[PDB]
Structure formats: structure tokens, C-alpha cells
Enzyme design. Structure first.
Site, PDB file in Angstrom:
ATOM      1  N   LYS A 182      18.586   1.647  45.831  1.00  0.00           N
ATOM      2  CA  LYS A 182      17.492   2.512  46.493  1.00  0.00           C
ATOM      3  C   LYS A 182      16.252   1.989  46.673  1.00  0.00           C
ATOM      4  O   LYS A 182      15.680   2.055  47.784  1.00  0.00           O
ATOM      5  CB  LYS A 182      17.359   3.856  45.276  1.00  0.00           C
ATOM      6  CG  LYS A 182      16.559   4.884  45.787  1.00  0.00           C
ATOM      7  CD  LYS A 182      16.302   5.754  44.828  1.00  0.00           C
ATOM      8  CE  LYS A 182      15.047   6.666  45.069  1.00  0.00           C
ATOM      9  NZ  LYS A 182      15.078   7.991  44.157  1.00  0.00           N
ATOM     10  N   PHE A 191      15.968   7.460  36.862  1.00  0.00           N
ATOM     11  CA  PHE A 191      15.657   7.423  38.344  1.00  0.00           C
ATOM     12  C   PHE A 191      15.431   5.771  38.761  1.00  0.00           C
ATOM     13  O   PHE A 191      15.920   5.258  40.027  1.00  0.00           O
ATOM     14  CB  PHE A 191      14.639   7.946  38.717  1.00  0.00           C
ATOM     15  CG  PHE A 191      14.600   9.568  38.779  1.00  0.00           C
ATOM     16  CD1 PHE A 191      15.880  10.161  38.740  1.00  0.00           C
ATOM     17  CD2 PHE A 191      13.508  10.242  38.684  1.00  0.00           C
ATOM     18  CE1 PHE A 191      15.877  11.654  38.814  1.00  0.00           C
ATOM     19  CE2 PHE A 191      13.533  11.775  38.573  1.00  0.00           C
ATOM     20  CZ  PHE A 191      14.796  12.326  38.872  1.00  0.00           C
ATOM     21  N   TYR A 224      12.955   9.819  34.210  1.00  0.00           N
ATOM     22  CA  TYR A 224      12.245   8.635  35.208  1.00  0.00           C
ATOM     23  C   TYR A 224      12.926   7.334  35.000  1.00  0.00           C
ATOM     24  O   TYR A 224      13.305   6.600  36.041  1.00  0.00           O
ATOM     25  CB  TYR A 224      10.920   8.716  34.918  1.00  0.00           C
ATOM     26  CG  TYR A 224       9.909   9.807  35.498  1.00  0.00           C
ATOM     27  CD1 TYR A 224       9.419   9.838  36.921  1.00  0.00           C
ATOM     28  CD2 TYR A 224       9.336  10.698  34.694  1.00  0.00           C
ATOM     29  CE1 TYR A 224       8.843  10.907  37.177  1.00  0.00           C
ATOM     30  CE2 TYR A 224       8.634  11.847  35.297  1.00  0.00           C
ATOM     31  CZ  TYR A 224       8.160  12.022  36.206  1.00  0.00           C
ATOM     32  OH  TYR A 224       7.430  12.794  36.663  1.00  0.00           O
ATOM     33  N   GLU A 226       9.539   9.716  47.653  1.00  0.00           N
ATOM     34  CA  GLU A 226      10.929   9.872  47.092  1.00  0.00           C
ATOM     35  C   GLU A 226      11.388  11.239  46.785  1.00  0.00           C
ATOM     36  O   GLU A 226      11.940  11.470  45.789  1.00  0.00           O
ATOM     37  CB  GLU A 226      11.309   8.803  46.049  1.00  0.00           C
ATOM     38  CG  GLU A 226      10.421   8.741  44.831  1.00  0.00           C
ATOM     39  CD  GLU A 226      11.040   7.464  43.857  1.00  0.00           C
ATOM     40  OE1 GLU A 226      12.329   7.341  43.628  1.00  0.00           O
ATOM     41  OE2 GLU A 226       9.993   6.900  43.209  1.00  0.00           O
ATOM     42  N   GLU A 262      14.713  19.716  46.844  1.00  0.00           N
ATOM     43  CA  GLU A 262      13.845  19.287  45.953  1.00  0.00           C
ATOM     44  C   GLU A 262      12.314  19.651  46.777  1.00  0.00           C
ATOM     45  O   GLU A 262      11.264  19.050  46.059  1.00  0.00           O
ATOM     46  CB  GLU A 262      13.805  18.121  45.350  1.00  0.00           C
ATOM     47  CG  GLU A 262      15.022  17.950  44.284  1.00  0.00           C
ATOM     48  CD  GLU A 262      15.242  16.872  43.740  1.00  0.00           C
ATOM     49  OE1 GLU A 262      14.247  15.959  43.795  1.00  0.00           O
ATOM     50  OE2 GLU A 262      16.304  16.406  43.032  1.00  0.00           O
TER      51      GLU A 262
HETATM   52  N1  LIG Z   1      17.526  13.954  42.864  1.00  0.00           N
HETATM   53  C1  LIG Z   1      16.581  13.086  42.397  1.00  0.00           C
HETATM   54  N2  LIG Z   1      15.321  13.361  43.024  1.00  0.00           N
HETATM   55  C2  LIG Z   1      14.369  12.368  42.640  1.00  0.00           C
HETATM   56  C3  LIG Z   1      13.029  12.814  42.824  1.00  0.00           C
HETATM   57  C4  LIG Z   1      12.165  11.754  42.756  1.00  0.00           C
HETATM   58  C5  LIG Z   1      10.537  12.211  42.793  1.00  0.00           C
HETATM   59  C6  LIG Z   1       9.847  12.281  41.355  1.00  0.00           C
HETATM   60  C7  LIG Z   1      10.271  13.317  40.675  1.00  0.00           C
HETATM   61  C8  LIG Z   1       9.098  13.559  39.530  1.00  0.00           C
HETATM   62  C9  LIG Z   1       7.942  13.405  40.397  1.00  0.00           C
HETATM   63  O1  LIG Z   1       6.885  12.611  39.556  1.00  0.00           O
HETATM   64  C10 LIG Z   1       8.192  12.594  41.513  1.00  0.00           C
HETATM   65  C11 LIG Z   1       7.575  13.208  42.847  1.00  0.00           C
HETATM   66  C12 LIG Z   1       6.580  14.313  42.133  1.00  0.00           C
HETATM   67  N3  LIG Z   1       6.106  15.145  42.947  1.00  0.00           N
HETATM   68  C13 LIG Z   1       6.813  16.287  43.377  1.00  0.00           C
HETATM   69  C14 LIG Z   1       5.856  17.203  44.121  1.00  0.00           C
HETATM   70  F1  LIG Z   1       6.543  18.316  44.603  1.00  0.00           F
HETATM   71  C15 LIG Z   1       4.743  16.664  44.269  1.00  0.00           C
HETATM   72  C16 LIG Z   1       3.525  16.945  44.599  1.00  0.00           C
HETATM   73  N4  LIG Z   1       3.495  18.054  45.708  1.00  0.00           N
HETATM   74  N5  LIG Z   1       2.522  16.213  44.640  1.00  0.00           N
HETATM   75  C17 LIG Z   1       2.706  15.299  43.952  1.00  0.00           C
HETATM   76  N6  LIG Z   1       3.628  14.603  43.110  1.00  0.00           N
HETATM   77  C18 LIG Z   1       4.866  15.602  43.333  1.00  0.00           C
HETATM   78  C19 LIG Z   1       7.208  14.514  40.955  1.00  0.00           C
HETATM   79  O2  LIG Z   1       6.060  15.196  39.885  1.00  0.00           O
HETATM   80  C20 LIG Z   1      12.309  10.372  42.131  1.00  0.00           C
HETATM   81  C21 LIG Z   1      13.702  10.160  42.337  1.00  0.00           C
HETATM   82  F2  LIG Z   1      13.992   8.764  41.798  1.00  0.00           F
HETATM   83  C22 LIG Z   1      14.603  11.002  42.404  1.00  0.00           C
HETATM   84  C23 LIG Z   1      16.174  10.635  42.327  1.00  0.00           C
HETATM   85  C24 LIG Z   1      17.061  11.707  42.096  1.00  0.00           C
HETATM   86  F3  LIG Z   1      18.235  11.292  42.048  1.00  0.00           F
END
Ligand SMILES: Nc1nc2cc(C[C@@H]3CC[C@@]4(O)[C@@H]3C[C@@H](n3cc(F)c5c(N)ncnc53)[C@@H]4O)cc(F)c2cc1F
Lengths: 311, 625
Positions: free
Chosen positions: B321, B315, B312, B423, B432
Site C-alpha cells: 500500500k 494500517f 494504526y 489515505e 469513510e
Molecule cells: N479501511 C481503512 N481505512 C484507513 C484509513 C486511514 C486514514 C486514517 C484513519 C485515522 C486518521 O488518523 C486517518 C485520517 C484522519 N482523518 C479523517 C478525517 F475525516 C479527517 C479530517 N477531516 N481532517 C483530518 N484528519 C482526518 C483520521 O483521524 C488509514 C488507513 F491506513 C486505512 C486503512 C484501512 F484499511
């Protein structure tokens, strides 16, 4: 007792043997194995004294190994060094020391072959860098640099009486007849079939248009520059033909050197007359005595100086 | 700084020569392990029983000196592909003897030439040497840009040089290398030692070596020009290739005697160090990408796996971004509520997948910039990430932000949202699972509700990389399919590669999805025109996304967002390399398949030749729902 400046030990691998008009034998040895990888120049007024160090006339040690050697008049010695330089070593007034005249690093790789032109003022050199350079022995510079071949230049041979004409063979299967008077000096010649790679070259001392060449398979061929098609060829050796030398006779005999540790003597029809297996290693250079035309001296990597009696 | 080496075919004293080249500034030395003229016999007597030693002793240098400073060289007389059987048999034994002596010394690299078309027996002896004991030693294949037969002087009267243009004939040296490495079954121990000629060939011949494993660049002294002062320099076209080779981090080797007699041997190296210091400095993306160049990474699955705190943090360190996301909400707020309703109307914002709160903070800054009333809902499924959100809510945010510890597809919202911010995008946009997550979340979005992002498109481009193909080939794991590594995508900073055609749009998704029967499954056919002779190894994936109106984020090389480094390109490889000719078209078929428990990608090449369907039924790769 050994002369001054001369080293106490001679290098095991003997590469060159050349007789001077007076009868003095010139020797070119190189250290291919062991700690030091350099070369040495030797002179013997008594040919039977060789290869003994403490019985020579003049001696010196070059910075790198000697790949080829040729007489420049009566005192000058042209050296084909591994360092990529074509050296010239002049014999002093008393003929007891071998002093360096010039050492010019022009070739990018090992200079494998050298041949002085008819006048004795110019010389040609063939190296592993695929280049062929025309040298000016007086000005100590390169007049012309040629890149006609595609692989390493194996042998370069200047014509007996023409300053512009010289032969050159390489691992690219090309035998080139040169003439500096032409805008395009090189000219591809040989047999009808490509065959095996050429290794050695020898101009006929009487016929200015006829020459002989030895391949990597041991076959020696008689070639005419006009016909551009090989008339006579014989499988003389079992391994690569190192060098070819003609006798000083009116009807010359051809001495054939090879990696099969044997020396052969052939007539005008390339027929075997004499054969010697005295050498335990690769026979590198042959030289006919100017005093006794029936005598032929050969050198090898086994540190042997064998004097043959040709019938 | 430039890591340099000196190539010499003549070494009289090993201690004096190494000390002299180190004084000049050379990091290493390319020298022969055995004398280049010392031809050895192994069958015929009496030459077979030659008294020893065969070469100089190993005691002359320390173990460290052999392991780091000395690069081996094969003897020029060794010709394993000679027409003579005697030379062919002797060269085989001499090649083994020299290679085994190099392994005995523990040399880091060994030079072997590719000066002709037929090198099959040379490949047979080297492959046999690699399979005889497990070693890490490298083998640099000495191959020039132009063959010596194609750069020779037009001085032969009866045999003139071919002045006619031969497109395939000009790239003959690449085919010598390609055939050699194919015969050796793409060994990671075999690399390219590219020799640069005095006259450079056509740009397409230089482009053949793109994506090839080049570890060394050989620069002879003859190719160097001379300026007014006397220093050795290079032409503007030769300099362009040096800057291109410097990016690949190759080791520059100097060969041939000094032709600039007035100057020392260090003058050639001084010009290479000058070009390395006068090259364009690495930008915000180029500095961050250092270390991750051609390094394969598994694509992140944030839905199936709960991400670590440091993931995180990486990120969050992307300012471009979140600056665009802030501008996207700022533009959306003004368009939804006017100046007369700036105090009476409050907009319901819902951050779906809040993480640690970067979009939540960006929504607060967007409200202060637009001077509008907002009500935030920070939804997150990861309980570990919720700990950071709840601590942020109590200490700073306050009652304005409502932290929700649930999945967006299962959460029952008390009120409908005006704007949903997320995001969920990856390197291939929907890899993703951004569509599936927002499809089961758009029920609590108002009839006139806006989604940020509202649209995203993935892009595919055919690439050539023998380096990356071998990297994927080495990803073979036990207790699974021995070819599963080729049937899965990889997030990788593509460095040593060649883009064969311009990226074309693959799959597109729009939010909210107004369709009565929403189907995230897709099928796309892409026809890529190739104007170069090449070898297809895989397909590079990129993405473009519309957050709100003109505000966008992109990893596509043509429209890449400057300063943005969150996503590296994705790579879809193929089990077998496909030969592609000039004028041929690459046809790829991409499928986005799914069920109730998982979503996956299926892909196959149909032109010029057919390939097997990669990842069928998601046997090797799946993104869990
Ligand atoms: N390749 C990359 N991907 C990125 C992805 C994220 C989204 C983060 C990831 C972790 C996270 O907290 C959040 C999204 C959340 N998420 C995922 C679900 F399908 C989900 C869902 N169904 N309900 C509640 N929340 C959810 C997940 O748990 C943030 C970025 F800055 C990224 C940067 C990148 F380079």
C-alpha cells in the site's frame, strides 16, 4: 447341561426360525438392547426344548446382530449381519458345533435380507446400502453387484426352481422381477396404483409365475407375473407385514407375520382361517414343520418359541 | 491436518469400537444412539409396553467422550413424512426420543437424513426439539450431491434411466435442503453433511452448495479408486472438490466397509492427510485473513471516532500500500519540477490525515528517490495521533515537516500546496467520507495542483451466502429496530460465498473536483446477468483507486493488488432472500445520500422481484460529517 462353545445366555430378540428337512429347528437371535449389540446361531433337534439354552444341539455367537437367516443344504447357514457382511456357518460332522466358513464385508450398510437360489451353490442378499449382490457360496466371492433400487432393500426372495429368477422389494415402492440371463435383469411389476411401500415377498411353491407381497399398511396381495395387475388383495393386519411363508401342503396355506404382534393363516382366496395373538412383541419369522404339515413355529422379540396347531 | 470421523451403522461394543477407530486415527465417531433395527411402538399394545432398557447405558463412556468423540445418528426406520398415519405418529415419538437422548448425552452433533423431497413433518419435529430448551448442539443434515434415484444402474428393462439433460432436475437435492432449512427458519444449529457419490455431477450442481453451511463431508469407501501399489486413491475431479472442501475447513467422514482388504482403514485417512499437505500453501493475504473468514466487522468511521494506537499499527503493517503511495509521489515530483529546477524549486506537500506519519515518511523517501526539494505539512484531526506525529517531528523529521492539529475542512493554510496526499479511503472507497473531506480542503490546493489519490471507483457484485445471511440475522440488538442489522454494510473477509455476477462500477469520485456545483450525492442502476439457479443474500463491495497515472490500488478480485491486505470487502445485505433462476438478471439500485450532518447509503433490488428500500433517511446506518 449345555453343549461346548455355546453361550450360557440366548439373545432376547429372536429374528429367525427355520425347519430343516429332518425336523431340526434353526434359530437366529440378536441383541438389539443392552451393553453388547451382537448376534447368535442356535440348533434344536428337539423343537419343544426351545428357547431353553441348556437343551440345544449346537450353539455359537456372531460378532454382530442377525437381520435374516436361511438354510444352505443340510449343514450350511447363511447369515445377514449388521456389520455389512454375508456370513456362512457350516455345521460339523457330529452336528454339535457351528463353525464359520466365510465372513466377507461387501455391503456398505446392514444386510437386512438373504435368500439361497434353487441349486444351493449361489445366494442373493439385500442390504440398507441400496445394493443387491449375487454370491458364489463355493468360491466365497460376489459374482454380480446390482444397484436398481433408490432406497434400502427390504426383502429378497429366490424363485422355487429357477437359478436366474429372484424377487426384490424396497422402500422406493419398487417390486423387481430379476433374470440374470437378460442384459437388463430387473423388471418393475405390481398393481395399477403405486399404493403403499412393499415389505415382504413369498414365491408360490407350486405356481412358478404367481407370488404374494405384504405392504407397510398390513395389506397382503396375490400377484401374477404375466398379468402385471393385482387381482386379489385383503387387509390382513393393522401394521407392517414382516414376512410371508407357505405351508408344505399340495394346496398351500399362507402364514402372515406382522409388527401388530399377531400371526394369521390364509387360504388360496387370502381368507382368514387361523389367528394367534400369543406373542407380546413383533412376530419376525414363521416355519412349517416337515414332519407334521399342520404345525407352524413362530419367533418374536419377546423371546418366545410358540408351536401353533393349524386346522 | 484433517479432522476426521468414522461412520458406522453397527457397534457391538461401544468401548472396543471407539478404541479401534481412535487407533486408526479418527478424531470422532458417527454411530447410532439406539439399534437401527430396534423398531419401537408408542401407541398399539402389547408392543407399546416392551420391557426395557430401550438402549445401552450412558455410563459406558465418560462425559468428555460423549461431548467430543460421539456424533449421533437417527434410525433409518424413522420416517416422519410417511404416507401411513401409524408410521407417521410412531416416527414423531421415536424422533423426539432419539433427539432428547442425544441432548441428554450432550453430543456435539446429530445426523438426520434428507433422502426424499417431502421432509416437512421431519422439519416440524426438529424445529420443535430446538425450541424445547436452549442448547448449542448441532444437527448435520445428511444430503447427497446426486439423489440415489439419479445414480442407479440402468438395469431395469421397463423403467430406463433418463439420459436427457435436466439442469433443474440435477440440482434436486439442493432444493430438499433449501426447503428443509427455510421451514426450520434458518436455524444456526442446522448444517449440511454433504455425501459425495462415485460419479460427480455437473459443475453447476456442485456450485449450488457454495455459500451453504457445510460442516461435514461424507466420503464412502466405494468412491475410492485403486492404484498400481494397492493404496486407495481418488480421481482428479474428486481431488478438486476435496481442495475446495478443505478451504471451508469441513470435517471429512468415512463410511462403508473396507474394500481394499490388503490395507487397513487408516489408508483412506492417509490419502486425505496427503492432499491436505500437498495443497497450495496460504499466501501473504491468505495467512493474514485467517480467523477473519466470514467474521462481520463494523465499517470504520475515522472522522466521527478517534482510532486506537493498535488500529494504526495494523494500517502500517501493509508494505504494498505505502510502496505504491511512495511511487505515486516519486512520479508526480519529476513531472512537476525538471532536472534544471532540482535545487531552486521546492514542492509544497500536504498530508491530509497524517495519522502516525506513514504517508509523511513515504513522501520523504519519494523526495530522496526523485532527488527533489520538498516542504511537508502533516495535518491530523485526532489529538492522540498528533502526539505520535509531534514526537516524530522533534526526534527525526525536524523543521522540514509542519505538524497541524486541526480538521482539513476547517484549517487555514499559510501557503498553497502543489500536491495533497491522503489515505481517507475505505472498503467501499467513499464509505469513510473521502470526497467530503477533500472538497473542503481543495481550496488551499494550487490551480495546477495534484491530488493523491486523484480518482477512485467502487464496485458491486451480487453474492449468495446462506452462512453470511444467518450471521447478519444473528446481529439483532435490543433498544433498536429488529431489522436494522440488514440495513447496514459490514467489512468482512467473504469466504463461504458465491459471486453470482462479475463486479460492475458503482460510484466514481475525482480530485480536485473542478465542478461549479459540487454534488457528492449519487444514484446508480446495475444490471447483473445470472447464469445459475441461486438465492440472493447480499452485495459484495470492492474498490479501485488511481493514486497517480499507472500507479493503482485495488481490492476488486479481478485486479487485486498482490500482497496488499489493508481492506477486506464490504457487504450490503438484504432483509429477505431473493430466489434467482438461470438466465435471470439481478437489478440493484444504489443511492449515496447526504445532508449537512451525515452521509449514508440506500439500496433496493428491482429484478427478478422487488425488495424494500434499505436504510431510508439513514434510519439504521449513517456516516457522520
Ligand atoms: N479501511 C481503512 N481505512 C484507513 C484509513 C486511514 C486514514 C486514517 C484513519 C485515522 C486518521 O488518523 C486517518 C485520517 C484522519 N482523518 C479523517 C478525517 F475525516 C479527517 C479530517 N477531516 N481532517 C483530518 N484528519 C482526518 C483520521 O483521524 C488509514 C488507513 F491506513 C486505512 C486503512 C484501512 F484499511
Amino acid at each position: 447341561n449345555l453343549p461346548p462353545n455355546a453361550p450360557a445366555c440366548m439373545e432376547r430378540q429372536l429374528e429367525a426360525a427355520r425347519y430343516r428337512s429332518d425336523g431340526a429347528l434353526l434359530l437366529g437371535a440378536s441383541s438389539l438392547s443392552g451393553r453388547c449389540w451382537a448376534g447368535s446361531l442356535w440348533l434344536f433337534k428337539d423343537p419343544c426344548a426351545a428357547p431353553n439354552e441348556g437343551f440345544c444341539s449346537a450353539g455359537v455367537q456372531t460378532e454382530a446382530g442377525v437381520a435374516d437367516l436361511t438354510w444352505v443344504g443340510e449343514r450350511g447357514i447363511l447369515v445377514a449381519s449388521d456389520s455389512g457382511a454375508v456370513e456362512l456357518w457350516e455345521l460339523d460332522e457330529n452336528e454339535t458345533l457351528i463353525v464359520s466358513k466365510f465372513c466377507k464385508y461387501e455391503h456398505d450398510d446392514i444386510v437386512s435380507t438373504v435368500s439361497v437360489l434353487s441349486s444351493g451353490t449361489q445366494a442373493v442378499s439385500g442390504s440398507k446400502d441400496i445394493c443387491i449382490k449375487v454370491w458364489d457360496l463355493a468360491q466365497q466371492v460376489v459374482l454380480s453387484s446390482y444397484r436398481a433400487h433408490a432406497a434400502q432393500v427390504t426383502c429378497v426372495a429366490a424363485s422355487p426352481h429357477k437359478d436366474s429368477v429372484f424377487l426384490s422389494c424396497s422402500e422406493d415402492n419398487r417390486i423387481l422381477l430379476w433374470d440374470t440371463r437378460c442384459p437388463k435383469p430387473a423388471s418393475q411389476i405390481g398393481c395399477s396404483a403405486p399404493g403403499y411401500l412393499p415389505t415382504s415377498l413369498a414365491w408360490h411353491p407350486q405356481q412358478s409365475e404367481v407370488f404374494v407381497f405384504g405392504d407397510e399398511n398390513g395389506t397382503v396381495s396375490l400377484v401374477d407375473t404375466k398379468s402385471t395387475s393385482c387381482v386379489l388383495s385383503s387387509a390382513v393386519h393393522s401394521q407392517c407385514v414382516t414376512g410371508l411363508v407357505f405351508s408344505p401342503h399340495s394346496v398351500p396355506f399362507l402364514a402372515s407375520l406382522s409388527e401388530d404382534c399377531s400371526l394369521a393363516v390364509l387360504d388360496s382366496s387370502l381368507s382368514e382361517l387361523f389367528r394367534s395373538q400369543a406373542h407380546r412383541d413383533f412376530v419376525r419369522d414363521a416355519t412349517w414343520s416337515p414332519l407334521n404339515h399342520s404345525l407352524l413355529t413362530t419367533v418374536g422379540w419377546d423371546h418366545q418359541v410358540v408351536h401353533h396347531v393349524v386346522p | 491436518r484433517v479432522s476426521s470421523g468414522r461412520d458406522l451403522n453397527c457397534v457391538p461394543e461401544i468401548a472396543d469400537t471407539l478404541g479401534a477407530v481412535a487407533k486408526q486415527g479418527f478424531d470422532f465417531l458417527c454411530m447410532p444412539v439406539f439399534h437401527p433395527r430396534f423398531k419401537r411402538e408408542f401407541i398399539q399394545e402389547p408392543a407399546k409396553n416392551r420391557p426395557g432398557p430401550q438402549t445401552r447405558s450412558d455410563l459406558l463412556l465418560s462425559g468428555r467422550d460423549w461431548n467430543t468423540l460421539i456424533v449421533g445418528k437417527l434410525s433409518p426406520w424413522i420416517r416422519p413424512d410417511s404416507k401411513v398415519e401409524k408410521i407417521r405418529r410412531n416416527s414423531e415419538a421415536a424422533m423426539l426420543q432419539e433427539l432428547n437422548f442425544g441432548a441428554y448425552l450432550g453430543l456435539p452433533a446429530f445426523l438426520l437424513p434428507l433422502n426424499q423431497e417431502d421432509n416437512t413433518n421431519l422439519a416440524r419435529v426438529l424445529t420443535n426439539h430446538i425450541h424445547t430448551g436452549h442448547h448449542s448442539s448441532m444437527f448435520w443434515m445428511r444430503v447427497p450431491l446426486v439423489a440415489p434415484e439419479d445414480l442407479r444402474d440402468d438395469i431395469i428393462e421397463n423403467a430406463p434411466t433418463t439420459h436427457t439433460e435436466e439442469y433443474s432436475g440435477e440440482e434436486k437435492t439442493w432444493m430438499w435442503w433449501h426447503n428443509f432449512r427455510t421451514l426450520c427458519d434458518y436455524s444456526k444449529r442446522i448444517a449440511v453433511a454433504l455425501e459425495i457419490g462415485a460419479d460427480l455431477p455437473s459443475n453447476h450442481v456442485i456450485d449450488r452448495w457454495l455459500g451453504e453451511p457445510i460442516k461435514a463431508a461424507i466420503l464412502p469407501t466405494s468412491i475410492f479408486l485403486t492404484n498400481k501399489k494397492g493404496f486407495p486413491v481418488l480421481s482428479k475431479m474428486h481431488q478438486r472438490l476435496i481442495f475446495r472442501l478443505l478451504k471451508l475447513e469441513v470435517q471429512f467422514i468415512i463410511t462403508g466397509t473396507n474394500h481394499h482388504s490388503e490395507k487397513e482403514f487408516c489408508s483412506y485417512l492417509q490419502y486425505l492427510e496427503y492432499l491436505s499437505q500437498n495443497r497450495p500453501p496460504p499466501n501473504a493475504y491468505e495467512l493474514f485473513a485467517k480467523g477473519y473468514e466470514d467474521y462481520l466487522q463494523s465499517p470504520l468511521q475515522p472522522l466521527m471516532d478517534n482510532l486506537e494506537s493498535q488500529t494504526y499499527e495494523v494500517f502500517e503493517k501493509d508494505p504494498i500500500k505505502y510502496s505504491q503511495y511512495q511511487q505515486a509521489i516519486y512520479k508526480c515530483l519529476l513531472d512537476r519540477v525538471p532536472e534544471e529546477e532540482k535545487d531552486t524549486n521546492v514542492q509544497v506537500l500536504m498530508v491530509l490525515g497524517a495519522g502516525r506519519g506513514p504517508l509523511v515518511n513515504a513522501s520523504l523517501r519519494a523526495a530522496k528517490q526523485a532527488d527533489r526539494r520538498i516542504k511537508l505539512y502533516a495535518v491530523e484531526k485526532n489529538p492522540n495521533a498528533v502526539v505520535t506525529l509531534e514526537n516524530w517531528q522533534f526526534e527525526e523529521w525536524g523543521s522540514q515537516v509542519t505538524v497541524v492539529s486541526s480538521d482539513m475542512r476547517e484549517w487555514v493554510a499559510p501557503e498553497k500546496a502543489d500536491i495533497i496526499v491522503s489515505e481517507l479511503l475505505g472498503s467501499f472507497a467513499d464509505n469513510e467520507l473521502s470526497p467530503e473531506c477533500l472538497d473542503g480542503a481543495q481550496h488551499f490546493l494550487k490551480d495546477d495542483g495534484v491530488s493523491i489519490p486523484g480518482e477512485y471507483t467502487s464496485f458491486l457484485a451480487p453474492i449468495s451466502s446462506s452462512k453470511l445471511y444467518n450471521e447478519v440475522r444473528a446481529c439483532r440488538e435490543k433498544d433498536r429496530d429488529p431489522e436494522a442489522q440488514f440495513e447496514m454494510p459490514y467489512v468482512v473477509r467473504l469466504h463461504n460465498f458465491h459471486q453470482l455476477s462479475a463486479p460492475q462500477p458503482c460510484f466514481t469520485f475525482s480530485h480536485p473536483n473542478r465542478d461549479p456545483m459540487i454534488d457528492n450525492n449519487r444514484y446508480c442502476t446495475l444490471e447483473f446477468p445470472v447464469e445459475v439457479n441461486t438465492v440472493l443474500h447480499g452485495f459484495a463491495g470492492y474498490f479501485e483507486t488511481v493514486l497517480y497515472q499507472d500507479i493503482t490500488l485495488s481490492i476488486r478480485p479481478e485486479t487485486h493488488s498482490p500482497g496488499m491486505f489493508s481492506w477486506f470487502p464490504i457487504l450490503f445485505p438484504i432483509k429477505q432472500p431473493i430466489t434467482v433462476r438461470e438466465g435471470q438478471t439481478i437489478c440493484v439500485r444504489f443511492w449515496r445520500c447526504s445532508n449537512s450532518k451525515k452521509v449514508w447509503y440506500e439500496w433496493a433490488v428491482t429484478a427478478p422481484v422487488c425488495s424494500a428500500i434499505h436504510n431510508p433517511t439513514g434510519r439504521s446506518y449513517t456516516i457522520g460529517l
